[PDB]
Coordinates of C-alpha atoms in Angstrom, one line a residue:
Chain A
X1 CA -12.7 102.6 -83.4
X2 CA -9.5 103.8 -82.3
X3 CA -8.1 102.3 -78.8
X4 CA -6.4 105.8 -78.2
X5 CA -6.7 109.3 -79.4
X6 CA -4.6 110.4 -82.3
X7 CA -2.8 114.0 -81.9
X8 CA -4.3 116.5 -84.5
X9 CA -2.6 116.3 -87.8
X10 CA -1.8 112.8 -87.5
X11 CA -3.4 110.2 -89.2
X12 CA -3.8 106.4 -87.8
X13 CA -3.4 104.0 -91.1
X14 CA -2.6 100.3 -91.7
X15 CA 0.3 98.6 -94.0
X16 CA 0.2 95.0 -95.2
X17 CA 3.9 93.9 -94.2
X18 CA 4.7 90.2 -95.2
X19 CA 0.7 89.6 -94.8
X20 CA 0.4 90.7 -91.4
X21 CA -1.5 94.1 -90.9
X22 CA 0.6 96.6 -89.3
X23 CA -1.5 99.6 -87.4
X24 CA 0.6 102.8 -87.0
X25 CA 0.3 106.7 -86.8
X26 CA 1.9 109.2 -88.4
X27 CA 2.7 112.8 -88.9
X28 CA 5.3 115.1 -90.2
X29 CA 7.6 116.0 -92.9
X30 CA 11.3 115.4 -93.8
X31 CA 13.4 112.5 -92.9
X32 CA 11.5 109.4 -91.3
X33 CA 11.7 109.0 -87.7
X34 CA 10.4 105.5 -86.3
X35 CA 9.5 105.2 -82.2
X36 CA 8.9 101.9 -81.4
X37 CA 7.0 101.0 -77.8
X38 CA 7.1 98.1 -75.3
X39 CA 5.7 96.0 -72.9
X40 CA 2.5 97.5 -71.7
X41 CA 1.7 99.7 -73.9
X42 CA 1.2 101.1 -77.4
X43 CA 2.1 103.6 -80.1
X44 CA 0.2 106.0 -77.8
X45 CA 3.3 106.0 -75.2
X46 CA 4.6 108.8 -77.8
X47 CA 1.7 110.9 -78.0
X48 CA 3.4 113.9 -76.2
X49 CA 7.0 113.5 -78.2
X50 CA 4.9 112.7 -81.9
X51 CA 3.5 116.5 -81.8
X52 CA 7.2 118.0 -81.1
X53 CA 9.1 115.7 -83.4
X54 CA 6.5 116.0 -86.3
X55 CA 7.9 120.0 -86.5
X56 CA 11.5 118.4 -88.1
X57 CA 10.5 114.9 -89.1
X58 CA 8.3 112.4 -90.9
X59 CA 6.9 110.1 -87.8
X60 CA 5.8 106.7 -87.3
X61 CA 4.6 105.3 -84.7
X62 CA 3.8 101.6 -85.4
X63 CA 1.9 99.0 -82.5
X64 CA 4.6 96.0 -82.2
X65 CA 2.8 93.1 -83.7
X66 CA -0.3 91.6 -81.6
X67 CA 0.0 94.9 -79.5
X68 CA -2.4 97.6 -79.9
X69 CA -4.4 97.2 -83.3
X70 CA -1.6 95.2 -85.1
X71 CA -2.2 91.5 -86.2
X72 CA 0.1 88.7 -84.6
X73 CA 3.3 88.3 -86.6
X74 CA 2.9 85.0 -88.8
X75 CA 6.5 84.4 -88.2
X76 CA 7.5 84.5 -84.8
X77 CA 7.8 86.2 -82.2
X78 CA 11.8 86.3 -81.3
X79 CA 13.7 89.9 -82.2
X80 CA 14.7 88.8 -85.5
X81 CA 11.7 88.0 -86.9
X82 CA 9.6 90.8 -85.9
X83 CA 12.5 93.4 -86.7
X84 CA 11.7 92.1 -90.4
X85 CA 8.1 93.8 -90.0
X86 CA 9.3 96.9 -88.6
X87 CA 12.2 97.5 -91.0
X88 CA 10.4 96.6 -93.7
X89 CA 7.5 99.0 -92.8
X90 CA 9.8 101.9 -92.3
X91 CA 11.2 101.1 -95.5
X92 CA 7.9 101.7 -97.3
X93 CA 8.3 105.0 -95.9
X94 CA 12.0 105.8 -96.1
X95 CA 13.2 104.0 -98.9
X96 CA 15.6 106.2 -100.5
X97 CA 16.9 107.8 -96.9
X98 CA 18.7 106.4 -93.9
X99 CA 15.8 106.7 -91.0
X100 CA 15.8 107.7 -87.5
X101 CA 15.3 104.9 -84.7
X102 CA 13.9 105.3 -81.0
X103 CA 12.6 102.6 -78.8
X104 CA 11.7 101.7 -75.5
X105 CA 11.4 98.5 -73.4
X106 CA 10.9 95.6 -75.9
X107 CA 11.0 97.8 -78.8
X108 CA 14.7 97.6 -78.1
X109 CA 14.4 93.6 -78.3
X110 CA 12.3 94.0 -81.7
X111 CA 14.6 96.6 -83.3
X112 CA 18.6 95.6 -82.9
X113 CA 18.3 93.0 -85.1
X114 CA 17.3 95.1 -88.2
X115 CA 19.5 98.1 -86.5
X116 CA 22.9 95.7 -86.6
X117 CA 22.0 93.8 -90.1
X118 CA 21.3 96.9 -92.1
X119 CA 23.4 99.5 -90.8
X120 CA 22.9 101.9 -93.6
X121 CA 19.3 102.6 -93.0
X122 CA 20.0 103.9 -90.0
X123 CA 21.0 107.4 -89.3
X124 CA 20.4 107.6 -85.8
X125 CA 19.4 105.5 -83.0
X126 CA 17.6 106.2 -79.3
X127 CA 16.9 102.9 -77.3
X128 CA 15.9 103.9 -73.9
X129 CA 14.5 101.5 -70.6
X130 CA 15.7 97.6 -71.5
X131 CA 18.6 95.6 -72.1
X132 CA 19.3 94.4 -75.5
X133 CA 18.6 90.9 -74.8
X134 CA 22.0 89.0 -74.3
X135 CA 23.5 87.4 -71.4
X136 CA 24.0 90.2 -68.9
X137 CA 20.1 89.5 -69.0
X138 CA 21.1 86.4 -66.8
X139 CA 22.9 88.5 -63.6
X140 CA 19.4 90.5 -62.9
X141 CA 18.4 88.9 -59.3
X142 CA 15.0 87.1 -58.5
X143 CA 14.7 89.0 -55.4
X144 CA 16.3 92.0 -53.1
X145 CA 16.6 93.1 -49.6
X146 CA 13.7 95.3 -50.4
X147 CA 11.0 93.2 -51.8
X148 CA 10.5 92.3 -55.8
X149 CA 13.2 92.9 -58.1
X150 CA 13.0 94.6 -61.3
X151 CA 13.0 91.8 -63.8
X152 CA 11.1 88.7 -62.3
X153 CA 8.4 89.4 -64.9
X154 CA 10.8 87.8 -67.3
X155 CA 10.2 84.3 -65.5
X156 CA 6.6 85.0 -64.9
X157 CA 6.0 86.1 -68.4
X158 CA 7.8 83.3 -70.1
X159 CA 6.8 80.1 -68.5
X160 CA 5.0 77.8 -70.4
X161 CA 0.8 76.8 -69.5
X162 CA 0.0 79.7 -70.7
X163 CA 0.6 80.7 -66.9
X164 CA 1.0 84.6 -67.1
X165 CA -2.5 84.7 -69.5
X166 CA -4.1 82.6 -67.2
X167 CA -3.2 84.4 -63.9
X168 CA -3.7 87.8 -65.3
X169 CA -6.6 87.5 -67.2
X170 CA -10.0 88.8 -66.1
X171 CA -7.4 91.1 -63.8
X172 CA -5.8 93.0 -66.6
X173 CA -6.3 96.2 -65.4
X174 CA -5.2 95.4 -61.4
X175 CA -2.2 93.8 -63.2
X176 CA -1.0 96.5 -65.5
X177 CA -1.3 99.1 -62.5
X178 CA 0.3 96.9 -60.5
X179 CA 3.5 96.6 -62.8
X180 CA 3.1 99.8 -64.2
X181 CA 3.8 101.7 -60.3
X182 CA 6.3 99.1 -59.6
X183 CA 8.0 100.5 -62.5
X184 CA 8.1 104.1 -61.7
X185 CA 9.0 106.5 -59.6
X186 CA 6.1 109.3 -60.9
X187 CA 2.7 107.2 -60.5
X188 CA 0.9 110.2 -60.5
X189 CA 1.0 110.3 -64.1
X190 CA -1.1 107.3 -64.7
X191 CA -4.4 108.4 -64.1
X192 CA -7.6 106.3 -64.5
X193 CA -8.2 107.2 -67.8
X194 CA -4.5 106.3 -68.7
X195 CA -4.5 103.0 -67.4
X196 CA -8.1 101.9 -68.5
X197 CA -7.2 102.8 -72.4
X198 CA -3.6 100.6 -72.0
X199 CA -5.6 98.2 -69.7
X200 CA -8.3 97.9 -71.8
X201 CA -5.6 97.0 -75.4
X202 CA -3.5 94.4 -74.1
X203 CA -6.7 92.7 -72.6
X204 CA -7.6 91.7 -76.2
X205 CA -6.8 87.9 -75.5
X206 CA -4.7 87.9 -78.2
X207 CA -2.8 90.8 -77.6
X208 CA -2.3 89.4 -73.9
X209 CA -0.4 86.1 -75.5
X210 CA 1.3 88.5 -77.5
X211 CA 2.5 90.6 -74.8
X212 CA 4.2 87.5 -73.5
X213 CA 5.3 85.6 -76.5
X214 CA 7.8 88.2 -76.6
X215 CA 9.3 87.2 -73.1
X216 CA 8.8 83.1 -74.3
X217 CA 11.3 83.9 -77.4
X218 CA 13.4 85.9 -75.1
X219 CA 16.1 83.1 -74.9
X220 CA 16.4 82.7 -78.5
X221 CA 16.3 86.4 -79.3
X222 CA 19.8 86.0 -76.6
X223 CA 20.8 82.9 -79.1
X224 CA 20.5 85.6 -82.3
X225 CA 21.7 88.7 -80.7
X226 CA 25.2 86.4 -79.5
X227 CA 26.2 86.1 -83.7
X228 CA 24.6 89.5 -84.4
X229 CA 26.5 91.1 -82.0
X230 CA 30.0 90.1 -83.9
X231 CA 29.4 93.4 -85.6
X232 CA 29.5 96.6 -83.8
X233 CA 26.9 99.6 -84.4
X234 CA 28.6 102.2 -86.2
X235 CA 25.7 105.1 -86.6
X236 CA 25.3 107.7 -83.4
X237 CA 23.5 106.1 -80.4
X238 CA 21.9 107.8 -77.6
X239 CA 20.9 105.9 -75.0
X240 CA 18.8 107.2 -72.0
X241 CA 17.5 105.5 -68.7
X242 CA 15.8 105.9 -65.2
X243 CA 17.7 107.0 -62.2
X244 CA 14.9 106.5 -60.3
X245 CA 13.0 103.8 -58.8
X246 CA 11.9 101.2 -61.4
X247 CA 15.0 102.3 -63.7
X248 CA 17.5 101.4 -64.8
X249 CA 20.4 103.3 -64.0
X250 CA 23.6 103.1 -65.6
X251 CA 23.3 99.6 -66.7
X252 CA 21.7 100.9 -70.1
X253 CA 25.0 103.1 -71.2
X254 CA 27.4 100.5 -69.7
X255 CA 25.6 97.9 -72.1
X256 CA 25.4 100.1 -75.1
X257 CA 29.4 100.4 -75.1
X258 CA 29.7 97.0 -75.6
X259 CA 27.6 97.0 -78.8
X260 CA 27.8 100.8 -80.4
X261 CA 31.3 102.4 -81.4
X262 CA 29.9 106.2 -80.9
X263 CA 27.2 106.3 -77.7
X264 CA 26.6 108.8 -75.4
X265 CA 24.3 108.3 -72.5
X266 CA 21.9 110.1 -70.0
X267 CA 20.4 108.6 -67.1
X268 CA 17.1 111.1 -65.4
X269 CA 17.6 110.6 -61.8
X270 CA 13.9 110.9 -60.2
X271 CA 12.2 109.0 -63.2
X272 CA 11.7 105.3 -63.7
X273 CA 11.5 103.2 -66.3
X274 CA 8.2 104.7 -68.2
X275 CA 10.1 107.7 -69.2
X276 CA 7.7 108.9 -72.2
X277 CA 5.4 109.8 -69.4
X278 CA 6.9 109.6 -66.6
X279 CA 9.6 112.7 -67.4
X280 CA 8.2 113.3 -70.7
X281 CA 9.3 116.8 -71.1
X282 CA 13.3 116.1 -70.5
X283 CA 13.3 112.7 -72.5
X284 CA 11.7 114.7 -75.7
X285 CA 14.0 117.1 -75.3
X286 CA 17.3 114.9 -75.3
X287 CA 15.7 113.1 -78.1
X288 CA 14.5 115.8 -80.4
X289 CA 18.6 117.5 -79.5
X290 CA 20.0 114.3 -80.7
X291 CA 18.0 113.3 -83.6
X292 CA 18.7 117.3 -84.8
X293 CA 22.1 117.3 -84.7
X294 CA 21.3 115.5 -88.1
X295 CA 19.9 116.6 -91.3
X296 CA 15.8 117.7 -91.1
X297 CA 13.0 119.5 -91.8
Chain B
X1 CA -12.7 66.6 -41.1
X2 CA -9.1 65.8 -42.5
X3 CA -8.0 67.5 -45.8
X4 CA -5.4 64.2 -46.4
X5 CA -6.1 60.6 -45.5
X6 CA -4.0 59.9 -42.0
X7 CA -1.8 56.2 -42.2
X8 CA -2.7 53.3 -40.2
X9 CA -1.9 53.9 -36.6
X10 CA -1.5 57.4 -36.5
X11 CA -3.4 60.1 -34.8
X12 CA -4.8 63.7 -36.4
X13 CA -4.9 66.0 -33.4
X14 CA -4.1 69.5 -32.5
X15 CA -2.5 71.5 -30.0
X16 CA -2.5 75.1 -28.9
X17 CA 0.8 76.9 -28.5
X18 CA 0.9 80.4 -28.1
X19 CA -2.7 81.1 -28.8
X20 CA -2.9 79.3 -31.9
X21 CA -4.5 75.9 -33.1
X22 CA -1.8 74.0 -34.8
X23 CA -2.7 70.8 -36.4
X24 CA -0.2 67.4 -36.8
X25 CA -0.3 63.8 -37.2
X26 CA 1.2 61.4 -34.8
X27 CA 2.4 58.2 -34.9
X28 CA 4.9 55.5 -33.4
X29 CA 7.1 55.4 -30.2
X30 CA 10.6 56.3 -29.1
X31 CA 12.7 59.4 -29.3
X32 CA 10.6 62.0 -31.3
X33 CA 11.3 63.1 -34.7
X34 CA 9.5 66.3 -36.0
X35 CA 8.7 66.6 -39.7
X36 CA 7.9 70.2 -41.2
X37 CA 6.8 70.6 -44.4
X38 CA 7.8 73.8 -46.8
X39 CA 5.7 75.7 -49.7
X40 CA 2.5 73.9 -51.4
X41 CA 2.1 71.1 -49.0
X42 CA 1.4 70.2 -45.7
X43 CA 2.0 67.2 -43.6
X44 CA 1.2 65.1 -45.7
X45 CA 4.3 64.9 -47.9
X46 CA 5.8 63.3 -45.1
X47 CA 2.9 60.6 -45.3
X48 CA 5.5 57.6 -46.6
X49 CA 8.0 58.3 -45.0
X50 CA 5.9 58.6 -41.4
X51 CA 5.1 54.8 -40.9
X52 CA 8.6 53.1 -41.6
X53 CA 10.5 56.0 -38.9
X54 CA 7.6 55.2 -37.0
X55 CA 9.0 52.0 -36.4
X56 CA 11.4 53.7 -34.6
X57 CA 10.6 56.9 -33.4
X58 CA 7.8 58.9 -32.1
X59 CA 6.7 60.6 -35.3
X60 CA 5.0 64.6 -35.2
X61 CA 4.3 66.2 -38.6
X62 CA 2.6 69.8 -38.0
X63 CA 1.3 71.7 -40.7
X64 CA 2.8 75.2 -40.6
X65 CA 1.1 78.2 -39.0
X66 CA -2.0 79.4 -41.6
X67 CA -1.1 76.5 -43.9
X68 CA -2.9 73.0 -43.9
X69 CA -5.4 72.6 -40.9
X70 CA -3.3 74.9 -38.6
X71 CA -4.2 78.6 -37.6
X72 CA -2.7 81.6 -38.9
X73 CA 0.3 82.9 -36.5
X74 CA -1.0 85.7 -34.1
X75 CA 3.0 86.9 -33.6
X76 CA 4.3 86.7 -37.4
X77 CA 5.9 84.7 -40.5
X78 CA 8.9 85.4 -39.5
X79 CA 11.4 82.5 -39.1
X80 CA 11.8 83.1 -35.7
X81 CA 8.6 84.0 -34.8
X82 CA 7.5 80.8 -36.4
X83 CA 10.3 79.1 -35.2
X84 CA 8.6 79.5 -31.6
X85 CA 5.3 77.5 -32.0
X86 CA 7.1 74.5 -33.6
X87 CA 9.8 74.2 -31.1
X88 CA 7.0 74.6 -28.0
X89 CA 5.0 72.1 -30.0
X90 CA 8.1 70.0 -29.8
X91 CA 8.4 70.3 -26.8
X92 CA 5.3 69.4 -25.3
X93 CA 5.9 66.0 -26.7
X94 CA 10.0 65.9 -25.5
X95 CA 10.3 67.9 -22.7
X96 CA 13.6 66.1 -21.3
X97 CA 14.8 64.7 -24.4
X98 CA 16.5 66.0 -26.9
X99 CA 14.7 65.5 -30.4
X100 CA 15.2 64.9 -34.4
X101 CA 14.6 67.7 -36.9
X102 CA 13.4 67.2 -40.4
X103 CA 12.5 69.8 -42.7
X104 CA 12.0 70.7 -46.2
X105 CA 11.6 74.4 -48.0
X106 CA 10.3 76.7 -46.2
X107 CA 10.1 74.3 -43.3
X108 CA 13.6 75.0 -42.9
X109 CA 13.2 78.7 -42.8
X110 CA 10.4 78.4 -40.2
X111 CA 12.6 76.3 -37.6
X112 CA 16.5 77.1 -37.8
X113 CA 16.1 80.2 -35.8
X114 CA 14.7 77.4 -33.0
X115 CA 17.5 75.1 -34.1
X116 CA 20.4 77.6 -33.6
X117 CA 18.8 78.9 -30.0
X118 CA 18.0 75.8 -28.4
X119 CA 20.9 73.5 -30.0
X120 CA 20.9 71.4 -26.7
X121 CA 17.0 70.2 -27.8
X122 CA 18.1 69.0 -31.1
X123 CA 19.9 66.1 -31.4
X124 CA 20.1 65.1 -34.9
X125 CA 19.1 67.8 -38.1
X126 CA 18.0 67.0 -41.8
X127 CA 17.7 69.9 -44.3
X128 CA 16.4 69.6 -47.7
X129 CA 15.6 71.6 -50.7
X130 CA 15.1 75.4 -49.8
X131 CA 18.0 77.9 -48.7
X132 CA 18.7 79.1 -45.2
X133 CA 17.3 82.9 -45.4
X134 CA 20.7 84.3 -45.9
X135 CA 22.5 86.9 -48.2
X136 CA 23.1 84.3 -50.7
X137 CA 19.1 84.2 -51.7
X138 CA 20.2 87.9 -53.1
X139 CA 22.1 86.0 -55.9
X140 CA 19.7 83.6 -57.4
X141 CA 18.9 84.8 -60.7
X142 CA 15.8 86.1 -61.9
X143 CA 15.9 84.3 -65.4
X144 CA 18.0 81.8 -66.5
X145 CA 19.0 80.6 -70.3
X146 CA 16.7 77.3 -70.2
X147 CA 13.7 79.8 -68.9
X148 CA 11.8 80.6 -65.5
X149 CA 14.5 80.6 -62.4
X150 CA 14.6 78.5 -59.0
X151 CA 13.2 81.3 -57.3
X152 CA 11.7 83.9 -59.2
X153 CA 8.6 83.4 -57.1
X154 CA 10.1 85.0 -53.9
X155 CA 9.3 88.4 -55.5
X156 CA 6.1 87.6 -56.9
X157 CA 4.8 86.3 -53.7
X158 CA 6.4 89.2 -51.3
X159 CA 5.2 92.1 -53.9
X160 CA 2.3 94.0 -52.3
X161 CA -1.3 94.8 -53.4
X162 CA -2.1 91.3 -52.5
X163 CA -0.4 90.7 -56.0
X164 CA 0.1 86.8 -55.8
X165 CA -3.3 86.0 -54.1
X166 CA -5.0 88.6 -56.3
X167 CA -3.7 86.9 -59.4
X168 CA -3.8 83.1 -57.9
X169 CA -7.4 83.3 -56.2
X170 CA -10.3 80.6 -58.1
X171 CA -6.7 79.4 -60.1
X172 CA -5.6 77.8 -57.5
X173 CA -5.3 74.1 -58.7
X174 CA -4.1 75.4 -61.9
X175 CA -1.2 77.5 -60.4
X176 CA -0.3 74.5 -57.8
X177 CA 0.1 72.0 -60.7
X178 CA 2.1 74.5 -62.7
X179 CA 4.5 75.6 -59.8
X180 CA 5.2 71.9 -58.3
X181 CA 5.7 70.4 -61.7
X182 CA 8.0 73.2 -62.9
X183 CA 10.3 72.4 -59.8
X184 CA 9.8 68.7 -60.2
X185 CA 11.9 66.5 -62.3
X186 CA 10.1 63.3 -62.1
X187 CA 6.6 65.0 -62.9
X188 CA 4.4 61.9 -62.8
X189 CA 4.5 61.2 -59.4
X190 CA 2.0 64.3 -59.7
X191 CA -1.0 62.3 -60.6
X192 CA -4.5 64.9 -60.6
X193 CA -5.3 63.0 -57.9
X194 CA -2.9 64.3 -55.3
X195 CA -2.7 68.3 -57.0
X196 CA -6.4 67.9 -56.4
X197 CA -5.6 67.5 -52.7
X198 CA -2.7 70.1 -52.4
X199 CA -4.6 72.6 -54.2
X200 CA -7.5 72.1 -51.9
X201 CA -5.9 73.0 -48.6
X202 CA -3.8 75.9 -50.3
X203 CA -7.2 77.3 -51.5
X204 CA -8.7 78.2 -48.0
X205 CA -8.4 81.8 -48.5
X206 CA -6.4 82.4 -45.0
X207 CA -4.0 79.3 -46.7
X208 CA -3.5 81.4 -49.8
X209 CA -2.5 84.5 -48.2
X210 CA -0.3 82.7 -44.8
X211 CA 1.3 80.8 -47.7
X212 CA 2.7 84.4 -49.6
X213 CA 3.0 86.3 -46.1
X214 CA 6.2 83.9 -45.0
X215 CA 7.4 85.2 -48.8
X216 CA 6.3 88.7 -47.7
X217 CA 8.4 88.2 -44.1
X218 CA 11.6 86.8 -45.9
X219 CA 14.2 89.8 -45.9
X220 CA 13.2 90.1 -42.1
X221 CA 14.1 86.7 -41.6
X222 CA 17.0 87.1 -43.3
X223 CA 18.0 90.4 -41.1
X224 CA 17.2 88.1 -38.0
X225 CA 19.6 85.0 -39.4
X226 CA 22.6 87.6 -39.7
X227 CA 22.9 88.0 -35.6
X228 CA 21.8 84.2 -35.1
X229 CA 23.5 83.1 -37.6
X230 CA 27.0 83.8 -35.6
X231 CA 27.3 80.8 -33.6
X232 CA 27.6 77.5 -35.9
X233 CA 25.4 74.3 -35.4
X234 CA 27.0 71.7 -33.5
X235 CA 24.8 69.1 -33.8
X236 CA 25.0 65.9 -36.7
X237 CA 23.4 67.5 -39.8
X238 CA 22.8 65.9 -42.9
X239 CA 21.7 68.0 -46.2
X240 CA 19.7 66.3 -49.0
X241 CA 18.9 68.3 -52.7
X242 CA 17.2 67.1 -56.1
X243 CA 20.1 67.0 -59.2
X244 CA 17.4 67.2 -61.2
X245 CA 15.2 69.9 -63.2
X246 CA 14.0 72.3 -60.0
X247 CA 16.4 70.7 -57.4
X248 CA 19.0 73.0 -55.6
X249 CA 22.1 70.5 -56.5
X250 CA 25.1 71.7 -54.9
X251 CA 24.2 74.7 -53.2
X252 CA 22.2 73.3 -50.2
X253 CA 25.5 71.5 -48.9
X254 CA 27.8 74.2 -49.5
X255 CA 25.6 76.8 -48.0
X256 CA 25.0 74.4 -44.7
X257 CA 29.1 74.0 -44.2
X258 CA 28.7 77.8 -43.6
X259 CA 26.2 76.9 -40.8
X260 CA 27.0 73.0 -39.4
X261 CA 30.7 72.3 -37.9
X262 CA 29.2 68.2 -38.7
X263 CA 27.5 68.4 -42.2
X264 CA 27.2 65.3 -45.0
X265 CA 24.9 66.2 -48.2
X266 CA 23.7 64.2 -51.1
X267 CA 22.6 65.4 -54.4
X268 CA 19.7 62.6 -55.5
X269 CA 20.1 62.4 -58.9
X270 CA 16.5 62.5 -61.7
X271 CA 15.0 64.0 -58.2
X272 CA 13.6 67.5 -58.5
X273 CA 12.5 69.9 -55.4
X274 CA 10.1 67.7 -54.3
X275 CA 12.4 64.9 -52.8
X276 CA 9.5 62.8 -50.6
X277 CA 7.2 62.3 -53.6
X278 CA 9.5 62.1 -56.5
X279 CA 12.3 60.1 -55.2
X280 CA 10.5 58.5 -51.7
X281 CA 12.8 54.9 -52.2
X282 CA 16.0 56.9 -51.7
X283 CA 15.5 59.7 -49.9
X284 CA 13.3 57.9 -47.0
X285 CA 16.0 55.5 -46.9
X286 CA 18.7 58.1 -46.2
X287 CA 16.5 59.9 -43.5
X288 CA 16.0 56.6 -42.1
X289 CA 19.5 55.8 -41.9
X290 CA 20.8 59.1 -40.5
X291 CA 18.6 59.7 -37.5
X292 CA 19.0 55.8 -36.5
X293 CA 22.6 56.3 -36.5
X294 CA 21.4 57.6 -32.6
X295 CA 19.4 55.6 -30.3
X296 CA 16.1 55.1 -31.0
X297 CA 13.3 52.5 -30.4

């Protein structure tokens, strides 16, 4: 039983990757573009974008390991080892062709690691709505002169007692609401039905741990990224990011320069940081504009 | 009924101030020393500490407004609306002498705004372990390279939707334990024992939610310390902080030299936030010392 609805002409399938079963869907022809989702949520963030890129491109759309239907990594859960599992499933799909990257919130965190070690797979590269964890990670505030800041989560998430899983759970759908609005800045586009289908996958007990083993190997993904980021990213880079409440602003362009040689950047003022559905039509259409300025279907 | 066992020789009672019960425990003679405890307690953390300055000094250790066994404020959690019960409870105890001020965490939020308007009542002042509400609080960071932050809870507590009392309610005891030994450096002192008591008191529903409102009234008492704030204290002050895992180190002297013209701080070294409990030999010997520097009994 599927946990969302797949868009017509796509199917949902599963790959063995280093004996972990990896749940994705896919659609499309010509050159492979992979959209990787984050905290909260699923493959389904890119329901509305899958449909328009799937015109030009091959696309996957995997679930992040122990997200959505995809087994726990047998790893670890720190951005290098589960960057293995993604590159290696976009491999089995591009592996004569340089691929096409996009990814949101900790898709960001399980992506630059395979992004900066195998530069040649990449064509072209999106990461929207998250730092890539390093120490500017460190500056974000605890609190503000207007209540809850926008990364406390990251404490909450990754202290130890199993504290975040214990708190939240049997409360997993007042939760995800909860952090979901505090997020945006266009609420109005999570409807019941919305929020009970992400509610109801990362309730999955051991999706819930997974959601926040992510945030508990968030200090050594830091340790990694500060030798990986000795190289520079050579391919084109878009970054995009909120300019609304919940975003964030122009930190995501001012940290890309540091990492990527050839960046541009767009920040959405009026849209937060859940931009696939929160300003869906403007952030497919800088996306699909990018990614087409390259060779497709 | 008393939610903590009362020493030998002193007295459980209450006193209405304002329109509200609040409950302390009373002991000794001599000039009067108030005691105010911060987040997760009550009175009792003062409970060793109470008999040797009662030696000494009249002794009055209230739990705060909705906390413990005293009533909910009917004004606000404000630190000056707080601030207002304690110093008429004071009061009615020394009204023609000045008196001694003790306070830890959020104890010290919910009395300097008393402290800086009535310096002439105040003869001698002991800060420990929690910032002034100040501008600085805005600087703490939300995650830190060894993990969760000092004070990453200020925004989970003040986030609306009930968030933190949603979450914490029937988890009480488990939260407690988790929060007081993640600010602790010497953890054992923590026996089951005495969470089982904490997490008790904290659990009275009206506990739980006065506990988060003085979280949720924070950036107001911060906007009130900004006028008040302008005239330094003149009185003898003496800062103390854990140098331990959870302990403010440094900060809580140099913070006070913005606010005391007569300031002397020590940093307690394998001593975490919780300064009575985990270190009791050397802190209580430091109070001690300090306020019998004036007369006493």
């Amino acid at each position: 039983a599927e946990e969302f609805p797949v868009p017509n002409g796509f199917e949902s399938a599963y790959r063995e990757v280093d004996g972990v079963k990896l749940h994705y869907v896919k659609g499309g022809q010509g050159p492979l573009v992979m959209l990787v989702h984050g905290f909260g949520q699923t493959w389904y963030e890119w329901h509305q974008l899958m449909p328009e890129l799937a015109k030009r491109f091959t696309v996957i759309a995997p679930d992040l390991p122990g997200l959505g239907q995809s087994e726990p990594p047998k790893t670890g859960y720190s951005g290098e080892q589960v960057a293995v599992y993604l590159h290696k499933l976009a491999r089995q799909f591009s592996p004569d062709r340089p691929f096409d990257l996009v990814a949101h919130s900790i898709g960001i965190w399980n992506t630059y690691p395979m992004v900066v070690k195998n530069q040649a797979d990449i064509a072209r590269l999106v990461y929207m709505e998250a730092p890539i964890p390093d120490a500017r990670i460190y500056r974000f505030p605890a609190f503000t002169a207007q209540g809850e800041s926008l990364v406390w989560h990251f404490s909450f998430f990754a202290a130890d007692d199993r504290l975040a899983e214990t708190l939240i759970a049997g409360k997993e759908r007042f939760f995800l609401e909860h952090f979901i609005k505090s997020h945006a800045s266009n609420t109005e586009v999570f409807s019941e039905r919305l929020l009970d289908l992400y509610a109801r996958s990362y309730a999955k007990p051991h999706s819930l741990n997974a959601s926040f083993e992510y945030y508990r190997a968030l200090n050594e993904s830091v340790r990694q990224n500060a030798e990986l980021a000795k190289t520079r990213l050579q391919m084109p880079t878009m970054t995009l990011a909120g300019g609304g409440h919940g975003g964030m602003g122009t930190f995501q362009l001012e940290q890309m320069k540091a990492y990527a040689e050839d960046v541009e950047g767009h920040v959405l003022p009026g849209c937060g940081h859940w931009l696939p559905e929160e300003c869906a039509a403007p952030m497919n259409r800088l996306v699909i504009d990018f990614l087409s300025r390259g060779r497709h279907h």
